[PDB]
Amino acid sequence: ELVLALYDYQEKSPGEVTMKKGDILTLLNSTNKDWWKVEVNDRQGFVPAAYVKKL
Numbered sequence: 001e002l003v004l005a006l007y008d009y010q011e012k013s014p015g016e017v018t019m020k021k022g023d024i025l026t027l028l029n030s031t032n033k034d035w036w037k038v039e040v041n042d043r044q045g046f047v048p049a050a051y052v053k054k055l
Contacts, residue, residue, distance in 0.1 A: 001027045003038065003052040017045030025052065 005023040019025060019040045028044060029037040035046040 002055045003027045003036070004055055005047075005051065006053055007051045009047050009051050011045065013046075015046050017043050017047060019047055019051075024055070027052075027054070 003025050005019040005021055005025060008021050009019050011018045017038065017040050019038070023040060025047075026039040027036060028039055030049065032049070034049055036049045036052060037044065037046050038052065040047075
């Protein structure tokens with residue numbers, strides 16, 4: 001499934017990933033309510049669940 005980046009987000013921890021508003025990310029794991037694992041182009045990592053929207 002895909003998600004839309006609602007805001008820019010710069011990774012702030014080793015396991016996080018950076019995204020730009022408007023980016024279409026592949027949702028890898030949404031089992032956590034606060035942090036979702038996504039694939040941004042060729043990178044994988046966590047971003048705040050609230051900053052993305054399921055498409």
